Coordinates of C-alpha atoms and ligand atoms in Angstrom, one line a residue:
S1 CA -5.4 18.9 7.8
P2 CA -5.4 15.3 8.9
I3 CA -4.4 14.3 5.4
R4 CA -1.1 15.8 4.0
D5 CA -1.0 15.8 0.2
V6 CA 2.4 15.3 -1.4
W7 CA 3.5 16.4 -4.9
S8 CA 6.9 16.9 -6.6
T9 CA 7.1 20.3 -4.9
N10 CA 6.9 19.3 -1.3
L11 CA 8.2 15.7 -1.5
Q12 CA 11.5 16.4 0.4
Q13 CA 9.7 18.4 3.1
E14 CA 7.2 15.7 3.6
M15 CA 9.7 12.8 3.7
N16 CA 11.8 14.8 6.2
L17 CA 8.7 15.0 8.4
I18 CA 7.9 11.3 8.1
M19 CA 11.6 10.5 8.9
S20 CA 11.5 12.7 12.0
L21 CA 8.4 10.7 13.2
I22 CA 9.0 7.1 12.3
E23 CA 10.9 6.2 15.6
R24 CA 7.9 7.3 17.7
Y25 CA 5.3 6.1 15.3
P26 CA 6.8 2.8 14.0
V27 CA 3.7 1.2 12.4
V28 CA 3.3 2.1 8.8
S29 CA 0.0 1.4 7.0
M30 CA 0.0 1.6 3.3
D31 CA -2.4 1.6 0.4
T32 CA -1.9 2.3 -3.4
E33 CA -4.0 3.4 -6.4
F34 CA -3.0 2.4 -9.9
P35 CA -4.7 2.4 -13.3
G36 CA -6.6 -0.9 -12.7
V37 CA -5.9 -4.4 -14.1
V38 CA -5.6 -4.3 -17.9
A39 CA -4.9 -7.9 -18.8
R40 CA -4.5 -11.4 -17.5
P41 CA -1.7 -14.0 -18.2
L42 CA -2.5 -16.6 -20.9
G43 CA -1.3 -20.2 -20.8
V44 CA -0.6 -22.7 -18.0
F45 CA 1.1 -22.1 -14.7
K46 CA 2.6 -24.0 -11.7
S47 CA -0.3 -23.2 -9.4
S48 CA -3.1 -20.8 -8.5
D49 CA -0.6 -19.0 -6.2
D50 CA 1.7 -18.9 -9.2
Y51 CA -1.2 -17.7 -11.4
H52 CA -1.8 -14.8 -9.0
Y53 CA 1.8 -13.8 -8.9
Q54 CA 2.2 -13.8 -12.7
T55 CA -1.0 -11.7 -12.9
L56 CA 0.5 -9.2 -10.4
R57 CA 3.9 -9.2 -12.1
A58 CA 2.6 -8.4 -15.6
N59 CA 0.4 -5.6 -14.3
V60 CA 2.8 -3.9 -11.8
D61 CA 5.6 -3.8 -14.4
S62 CA 3.4 -2.3 -17.2
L63 CA 1.2 0.2 -15.3
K64 CA 2.4 3.3 -13.5
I65 CA 1.5 4.0 -9.8
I66 CA -0.9 6.9 -9.4
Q67 CA -1.1 7.3 -5.5
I68 CA 0.5 5.9 -2.4
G69 CA -0.9 6.5 1.0
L70 CA 1.2 6.1 4.2
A71 CA -0.4 6.4 7.6
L72 CA 1.8 6.2 10.7
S73 CA 0.8 5.0 14.1
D74 CA 2.5 4.2 17.4
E75 CA 2.1 0.6 18.8
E76 CA -1.2 1.5 20.6
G77 CA -2.7 2.8 17.3
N78 CA -2.3 6.6 18.0
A79 CA -1.5 8.7 14.9
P80 CA 0.9 11.7 15.1
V81 CA -0.8 15.0 15.7
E82 CA 1.2 16.2 12.7
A83 CA -0.9 14.0 10.2
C84 CA -3.3 11.1 10.2
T85 CA -2.0 10.1 6.8
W86 CA 0.2 11.2 3.8
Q87 CA -1.0 11.0 0.2
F88 CA 1.8 10.8 -2.3
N89 CA 0.6 11.7 -5.8
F90 CA 2.7 10.4 -8.7
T91 CA 3.3 11.5 -12.3
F92 CA 0.8 10.2 -14.8
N93 CA -0.1 11.1 -18.4
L94 CA -3.5 10.2 -19.8
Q95 CA -2.4 10.8 -23.4
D96 CA 0.7 8.6 -23.1
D97 CA 0.3 6.0 -20.3
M98 CA -1.3 2.5 -20.2
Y99 CA -4.5 2.2 -18.1
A100 CA -8.0 0.7 -18.0
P101 CA -10.4 3.5 -19.0
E102 CA -12.8 2.3 -16.3
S103 CA -10.2 2.8 -13.5
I104 CA -9.5 6.3 -14.7
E105 CA -13.2 7.1 -14.7
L106 CA -13.6 5.7 -11.1
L107 CA -10.5 7.7 -9.9
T108 CA -11.8 10.9 -11.5
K109 CA -15.2 10.4 -9.8
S110 CA -13.2 9.6 -6.7
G111 CA -11.6 13.1 -6.7
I112 CA -8.3 12.6 -8.5
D113 CA -7.2 15.6 -10.7
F114 CA -5.3 13.9 -13.5
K115 CA -4.2 17.3 -14.8
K116 CA -2.2 18.0 -11.6
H117 CA -0.6 14.5 -11.7
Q118 CA 0.7 15.3 -15.2
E119 CA 2.1 18.7 -14.0
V120 CA 3.5 18.2 -10.5
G121 CA 3.1 14.4 -10.0
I122 CA 6.0 12.8 -8.1
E123 CA 8.6 10.7 -9.9
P124 CA 8.6 7.3 -8.4
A125 CA 12.4 7.1 -8.5
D126 CA 12.7 10.3 -6.4
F127 CA 10.2 9.0 -3.9
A128 CA 12.0 5.6 -3.7
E129 CA 15.4 7.1 -3.1
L130 CA 14.1 9.0 -0.1
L131 CA 12.0 6.0 1.1
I132 CA 15.2 3.9 1.0
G133 CA 17.1 6.3 3.2
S134 CA 14.2 7.1 5.5
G135 CA 14.4 4.3 8.0
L136 CA 11.0 3.0 7.0
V137 CA 12.4 0.0 5.0
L138 CA 15.1 -2.5 5.7
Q139 CA 14.4 -2.1 9.4
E140 CA 12.9 -4.7 11.6
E141 CA 11.9 -2.1 14.1
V142 CA 9.1 -0.9 11.7
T143 CA 5.9 -2.7 11.0
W144 CA 4.2 -2.4 7.6
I145 CA 0.5 -3.1 7.3
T146 CA -1.4 -3.5 4.0
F147 CA -4.8 -4.9 2.8
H148 CA -4.2 -7.2 -0.2
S149 CA -0.4 -6.7 -0.1
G150 CA 1.1 -8.2 -3.3
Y151 CA 0.3 -5.2 -5.3
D152 CA 1.2 -2.6 -2.7
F153 CA 4.7 -4.0 -1.9
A154 CA 5.3 -4.9 -5.6
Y155 CA 4.9 -1.2 -6.5
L156 CA 7.3 -0.1 -3.8
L157 CA 9.8 -2.8 -4.8
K158 CA 9.5 -1.7 -8.4
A159 CA 10.3 1.9 -7.5
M160 CA 13.1 0.9 -5.2
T161 CA 14.9 -1.7 -7.3
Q162 CA 14.3 0.0 -10.7
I163 CA 14.2 -3.5 -12.4
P164 CA 11.5 -5.9 -13.5
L165 CA 9.9 -7.9 -10.7
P166 CA 11.3 -11.4 -10.2
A167 CA 10.1 -14.0 -12.7
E168 CA 9.1 -16.3 -9.8
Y169 CA 7.2 -15.6 -6.6
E170 CA 9.8 -17.3 -4.3
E171 CA 12.3 -14.6 -5.3
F172 CA 9.7 -11.8 -5.1
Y173 CA 9.0 -13.0 -1.6
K174 CA 12.7 -13.0 -0.6
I175 CA 13.2 -9.4 -1.8
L176 CA 9.9 -8.3 -0.2
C177 CA 11.1 -9.6 3.2
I178 CA 14.4 -7.8 2.9
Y179 CA 12.9 -4.4 2.4
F180 CA 9.8 -5.1 4.6
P181 CA 11.1 -7.6 7.3
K182 CA 8.1 -7.1 9.5
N183 CA 4.6 -7.0 7.8
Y184 CA 1.0 -7.9 8.3
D185 CA -1.5 -8.5 5.5
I186 CA -4.9 -7.6 6.8
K187 CA -6.6 -9.5 4.0
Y188 CA -4.7 -12.7 5.0
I189 CA -5.7 -12.1 8.6
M190 CA -9.4 -11.4 8.0
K191 CA -10.0 -14.1 5.4
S192 CA -7.3 -16.7 5.8
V193 CA -7.3 -16.7 9.6
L194 CA -10.6 -15.3 10.7
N195 CA -12.6 -16.6 7.7
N196 CA -14.2 -13.1 7.0
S197 CA -14.4 -12.3 3.3
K198 CA -15.5 -8.7 3.3
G199 CA -13.6 -5.8 1.6
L200 CA -11.8 -3.0 3.3
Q201 CA -14.9 -0.7 3.5
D202 CA -17.3 -3.5 4.4
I203 CA -15.0 -4.6 7.3
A204 CA -14.8 -0.9 8.2
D205 CA -18.6 -0.6 8.3
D206 CA -19.1 -3.5 10.7
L207 CA -16.5 -2.2 13.0
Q208 CA -18.2 1.1 12.8
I209 CA -15.0 2.9 11.8
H210 CA -15.6 6.3 10.4
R211 CA -13.8 7.1 7.1
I212 CA -11.7 10.2 6.8
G213 CA -11.4 11.3 3.2
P214 CA -12.7 10.0 -0.1
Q215 CA -13.1 6.4 -1.0
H216 CA -10.7 5.0 -3.6
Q217 CA -7.9 7.5 -2.6
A218 CA -4.8 6.0 -1.1
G219 CA -4.4 8.4 1.8
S220 CA -7.9 7.7 3.1
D221 CA -7.6 4.0 2.5
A222 CA -4.3 3.8 4.2
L223 CA -5.8 5.5 7.3
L224 CA -8.7 3.1 7.2
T225 CA -6.3 0.2 7.0
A226 CA -4.5 1.3 10.1
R227 CA -7.7 1.7 12.1
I228 CA -9.0 -1.7 11.0
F229 CA -5.7 -3.3 12.1
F230 CA -5.8 -1.9 15.6
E231 CA -9.5 -2.6 16.1
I232 CA -9.1 -6.2 14.9
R233 CA -6.0 -6.6 17.1
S234 CA -8.1 -5.5 20.0
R235 CA -11.4 -7.3 19.4
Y236 CA -10.2 -10.7 18.2
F237 CA -6.5 -11.0 19.2
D238 CA -6.6 -9.4 22.7
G239 CA -3.9 -6.7 22.2
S240 CA -1.3 -8.6 20.3
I241 CA -1.2 -10.1 16.7
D242 CA -0.2 -13.7 16.4
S243 CA 3.5 -13.8 15.1
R244 CA 2.7 -16.8 13.0
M245 CA 0.8 -14.3 10.8
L246 CA 3.9 -12.2 10.2
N247 CA 4.9 -11.8 6.5
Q248 CA 2.1 -14.0 5.3
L249 CA 0.7 -12.8 2.0
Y250 CA -2.8 -13.5 0.9
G251 CA -3.2 -15.6 -2.2
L252 CA 0.5 -16.1 -2.8
Ligands
LIG1 MN1 -5.5 -2.0 -1.5
LIG2 ZN1 -7.0 2.2 -2.4

């Protein structure tokens, strides 16, 4: 089982496992699945970067996370034999929660069992308490990697701080850099630096990287993100990512 699935019933067991591994496998790749974008901000803003943040803020605050994928690697890009990736499945209620009906349809066709999420879905507050104590955050020794990172980190921040996201991007960025002092945004790298526009899967296809698991599920996407990072690091950066790219978020 290259993919370890996590529900409320084995949350502690799985976080313990990740904790025992993080020192030997200090690169964390993450992806998230949430109920889509439901609405856009109306009015006028300070900028396009500001427009993007307000869009993120409104949506992250209102819509509940459905999955988070975490894939661990060592610095050479090797995964632990224990697991290629973890898939954390969170509590969600189709009768009671806000979502775009289209996103739900896509996730269902993607394999998600919304019944199980309602029954044994993880509470984000429980996950966040363990994540905070895990050694994965607040530690400059750990590298976080994400494709399109505003949404991913925002959902973690939301779970960890248990308060609304900062009104302004500058403060959001400050907090983000506290909990995730060392991070790379693959979207920023691919598009803003290397001028390549393609999406996760497209990029994946060119690099002939084989997907493990279903598309649109966080565990699989997190693994794919890891493999894309290390291949790009190797092909275009000769072994080491440029430090000027650290903590640079795409579109913000
Ligand atoms: Mn993503
Ligand atoms: Zn995803």
